[PDB]
């Protein structure tokens with residue numbers, strides 16, 4: 238069987254990493270590609286570069302947005318390709334869970350930075366040009382079979398940012414989370430956001446409310462995932 | 470027959486474009502991939518973006534070097550891959566002449582910009598990471614059979630820069646052309662500059678002096694090319 242690729246999407250501190258860590262333990266057919274940027278936050282060359290650029294961006298996003306976004310997406314593509322070529326070898330219903338996708342990189346985060354004037358027009362268009370070609374050449378086997386959207390309120394997310402306590406995030410205001418929320422809702426709940434990838438309009442999406450704490454109590458959430466997978 | 474891929478290397482205004490435009494006319498087996506950055510100097514989205522970023526970089530290299538260098542290399546890779554799928558396959562002794570290469574992008578220009586402090590360590594390392602990865606995906610497809618190095622003095626080049634009269638180049642001092650010169654000499658003549666691509670240690674190199682005008686007297690240059698090609 239061909240691996241099913243499922244993206245986990247959601248706002249900052251919505252609980253994607255918690256959820257994906259719960260999933261991977263529940264089945265030998267289920268694997269996980271963590272978001273490289275989250276590992277950066279926390280020795281290696283990528284982590285050192287990622288460390289710096291992530292810190293530089295949150296210090297001055299108008300200087301570093303483009304550099305940061307291109308490296309985050311490159312890193313994602315590479316990690317995601319490394320998991321595909323490998324893993325879920327003999328499994329009967331193999332599922333690979335992506336913590337975010339190349340689409341959320343572009344259409345949530347990079348888009349947002351452009352609209353908040355942290356990227357100018359040249360940077361945005363260069364980025365999009367890069368993204369398009371970077372996809373077709375290297376990322377055709379990354380195409381998604383489905384999307385799981387972890388919906389939390391910006392208020393929950395800001396609270397959860399606090400709990401976690403990554404330094405580079407404690408500066409984030411509710412308004413920034415609200416903008417990111419609006420783009421998640423557009424793309425995933427309403428499905429208004431048009432992309433440059435035609436297949437994404439016919440891609441099935443599961444929306445889960447994750448406002449209530451689920452660390453010790455997730456069985457309902459996982460049952461929905463199982464129902465969803467069975468339709469793919 | 471597999472297409473032979475030859476890079477034309479040389480400093481700014483050494484006469485690569487002149488020579489490439491003479492070569493293409495002399496054999497129906499001879500084709501040419503122009504440097505995208507040159508075409509940005511002169512409608513398309515690449516040209517618009519290229520125009521802006523080219524102007525931005527020469528206006529403020531410590532802000533724009535990284536962004537410029539990534540988009541120049543992207544653009545070259547795309548054009549070089551695209552030329553590799555023409556009708557030159559069914560010709561007898563097919564040769565594709567690249568105007569500069571991904572190697573000069575990195576080990577001359579980007580290198581020099583980092584050493585001149587127009588890119589910082591993170592920018593430089595990210596660039597290399599991106600360049601390492603994205604080349605090694607296209608294993609062997611753009612690998613060169615040979616290099617032709619058009620050697621002209623920094624002084625000849627500065628003079629030719631003025632005559633040619635591109636806006637963004639009128640700021641270029643002699644010292645800048647001397648650094649680039651040094652890096653050409655190290656790489657292609659002394660062959661001391663070691664790279665990440667080991668096959669480049671063994672790639673044959675033809676050096677041509679082009680200090681003297683050759684626009685109407687180029688037969689000896691071309692004869693050296695043909696002799697060179699026959700040894701490949």
Ligand SMILES: O=c1ccn([C@@H]2O[C@H](COP(=O)(O)OP(=O)(O)O)[C@@H](O)[C@H]2O)c(=O)[nH]1
Pocket residue numbers: 247248249250251252253254255256397398400401402449450451452
């Ligand atoms: O039900 C939950 C979900 C998340 N969290 C905490 O909220 C923060 C954000 O979670 P996660 O790192 O998974 O979020 P992501 O940024 O990956 O969406 C962390 O401190 C989690 O331990 C929590 O306490 N309970």
Ligand SMILES: O=c1ccn([C@@H]2O[C@H](COP(=O)(O)OP(=O)(O)O)[C@@H](O)[C@H]2O)c(=O)[nH]1
Pocket residue numbers: 479480481482483484485486487488629630632633681682683684
């Ligand atoms: O034999 C020559 C070679 C070049 N040039 C001029 O020198 C400038 C630089 O040449 P080119 O644009 O080919 O340089 P490149 O930057 O492509 O190496 C241009 O104005 C050419 O017309 C010239 O007059 N005679």
Ligand SMILES: C#C[C@]1(CO)O[C@@H](n2ccc(N)nc2=O)C[C@@H]1O
Pocket residue numbers: 249272274275278291306309310341342343346347403405406
């Ligand atoms: C630290 C951190 C995090 C971890 O997901 O990275 C930010 N991020 C992530 C992907 C992307 N394309 N752009 C971003 O800004 C969001 C968070 O704050």
Ligand SMILES: C#C[C@]1(CO)O[C@@H](n2ccc(N)nc2=O)C[C@@H]1O
Pocket residue numbers: 481504506507510523538541573574575578579635637638
């Ligand atoms: C205009 C112009 C030119 C045209 O070759 O572009 C500059 N260039 C080119 C390639 C590269 N990787 N970095 C550069 O800076 C050199 C010239 O000035």
